[PDB]
Design a protein around this ligand. Structure first.
Ligand SMILES: [Cl-]
Ligand SMILES: [Cl-]
Length: 361
């Protein structure tokens, strides 16, 4: 959680009920400005996985990038001639889904004239997934490390990185865009995880033109996929729905529990898929092999959802998502040039925008 400094000046406070009423209907599908990278095909044998046909989770080490907006060389180039607001899908999803968030987060905004850059701070846990964040009683750091919030987060994050690569068909020729991955040399591209980037543009009215990096994890025989893993750590301690007993006949109830307890995580995943234009959101259901060990996991189920329809199922309204973003953009455009910080208050349902000194970070 970022340390609020005494020389930070509050510009605006926004409570969740106000944010929840915001709307900007009519925003079009993103327009591709540049597409990059090479993505692997999904292995449809994983469609046969179920509780009676579980598969061990494999450890597959590939490199993942989560480059912030201003360090992205494609965004730097595009900003010379295109748009006036810049971000990435992960940063946008955090803002757009803020009214679902509980745990703290922050985003830095730099304003130069009529251009805005939204970034994450360097060396933070911004990328980590949360676990049971929106439970009535979230996990507490009361005990050893096995089920602490921090360890649960790293466990979920690790599970997701492995799952997304395991379900790929490594021998199938990849789908390659004309431009390669911008975060690695061609000579070494073999070592990066399967990913395709779409740098997309949106008209948000009032002359606001957003450019942001979006991505897909895989392709399917061409359909583009966003691949994510739900995970079960200890169902009893989580007071959850035991997956090995309930996935066969009550898969919907299991998902419903996930939605209640991981509301922000699931919405941010859905926004990521919608921003990229993925045709499907592919979920794995991954559980510990034993509740007492967080290093070994099994895949119990797989499912796919069309992102537009799934958004409606989790009560995510993109008209509201864009409305929230537009509200924040408008506030920033009215400020003096310089740096600003938006943050979610760790103990209250509100976000605050601060005027921070330019050399703060
Ligand atoms: Cl998350
Ligand atoms: Cl304002």
């Amino acid at each position: 959680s970022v340390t609020v400094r005494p020389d930070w000046v509050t510009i605006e406070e926004m409570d969740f009920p106000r944010l929840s009423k915001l709307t900007l209907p009519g925003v079009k599908e993103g327009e591709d400005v540049l597409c990059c990278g090479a993505v692997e095909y999904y292995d449809k044998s994983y469609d046969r996985v179920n509780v009676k046909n579980e598969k061990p989770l494999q450890r597959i080490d590939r490199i993942f990038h989560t480059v912030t907006t201003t360090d992205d060389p494609v965004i730097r180039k595009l900003s010379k001639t295109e748009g006036n607001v810049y971000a990435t899908d992960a940063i946008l999803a955090t803002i757009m889904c803020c009214t679902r968030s509980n745990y703290s987060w922050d985003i830095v905004i730099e304003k130069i004239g009529n251009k805005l850059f939204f970034d994450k701070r360097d060396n933070t846990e911004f990328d980590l997934l949360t676990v049971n964040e929106t439970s009535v009683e979230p996990p507490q750091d009361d005990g050893n490390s096995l089920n602490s919030p921090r360890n649960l987060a790293l466990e979920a994050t690790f599970i997701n990185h492995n799952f997304s690569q395991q379900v790929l068909k490594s021998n199938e020729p990849r789908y390659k865009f004309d431009e390669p991955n911008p975060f690695i040399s061609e000579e070494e591209e073999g070592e990066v995880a399967s990913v395709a980037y779409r740098y997309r543009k949106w008209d948000l009215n009032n002359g606001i033109t957003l450019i942001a990096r979006c991505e897909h994890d895989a392709v399917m025989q061409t359909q583009f996929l966003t691949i994510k893993a739900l995970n079960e750590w200890d169902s009893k301690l989580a007071n959850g729905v035991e997956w090995r007993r309930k996935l066969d006949t009550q898969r919907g109830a299991v998902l419903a529990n996930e939605l209640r307890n991981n509301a922000c995580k699931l919405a941010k995943w859905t926004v990521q898929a919608l921003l990229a234009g993925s045709d499907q959101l592919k979920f794995g259901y991954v559980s510990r092999a034993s509740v007492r060990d967080s290093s070994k996991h099994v895949i119990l189920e797989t499912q796919q959802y069309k992102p537009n329809e799934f958004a409606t199922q989790i009560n995510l309204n993109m008209d509201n998502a864009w409305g929230i973003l537009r509200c924040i953009i408008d506030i920033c455009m009215n400020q003096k040039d310089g740096k600003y910080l938006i943050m979610k208050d760790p103990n209250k349902p509100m976000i605050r925008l601060y005027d921070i000194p330019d050399n703060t970070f």
